[PDB]
Design a protein around this ligand. Sequence first.
Ligand SMILES: Nc1nc2ccc(F)cc2s1
Lengths: 142, 142
Amino acid sequence: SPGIWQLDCTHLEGKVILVAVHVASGYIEAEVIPAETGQETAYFLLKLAGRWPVKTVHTDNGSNFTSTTVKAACWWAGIKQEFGIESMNKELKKIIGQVRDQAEHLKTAVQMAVFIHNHKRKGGIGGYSAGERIVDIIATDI
Amino acid sequence: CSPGIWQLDCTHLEGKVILVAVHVASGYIEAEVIPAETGQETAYFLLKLAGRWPVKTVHTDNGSNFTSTTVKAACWWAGIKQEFVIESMNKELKKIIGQVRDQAEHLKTAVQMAVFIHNHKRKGGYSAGERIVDIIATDIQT
Ligand SMILES: Nc1nc2ccc(F)cc2s1
């Protein structure tokens, strides 16, 4: 189902990175957040939901994800939370390692890695990148 | 017009700076309150945008944040041509901001609520969110 996303917090360089994956496509969005809090998580989720048609979000029982602020954002946006990507975290961290030297700050490196992940040609022919896939899948669904 | 073209501009509200991106072919928008009207903040926003959508060309005015070499380096890295609608989009967005404000103390949150309403709810029978995905998918498929 094209409305399903997984969200998770992972950790690198002593910082927190919130990762969202579109399950059907493998498309990713990620951002370094100042602290592993409900407030930061809710803002991230609200931005995500204004951009893609988000219906259900699967997370673990981490305190940021079970927070009242996240519950409120999901309620406002009409998102169903399921409690309850690890390979995605691994792939994202791998790409981060590949570009890390091209930025001073991890926050910039993370966005470079998202770009690379979503846009890189897969299987030796155009049209099968994560970013091309999510667009095709969502368009076909509507 | 080409599905890879976006316009970016800054607008102001309550003494804060709001960076706005419009996908020209669809009317879809992304916006965020940014800490300062700087090249660094603009470049970060643009890198995130470019990691999410296939951005080929960005139109802006000659504001110092848009002409900065940090924005230029981001465009180089991401393969984006800079060229030096949004007017009305700014007014539209501000109107919605007032309408969602009841669940948003901070303008930061309000802005994202308004983007959500603009892209998903307004149908003026497709939403801008449906249109962008259909325009881009059709481009990919051809
Ligand atoms: N490596 C790690 N860094 C942080 C930073 C914050 C936090 F809450 C948990 C962790 S685990």
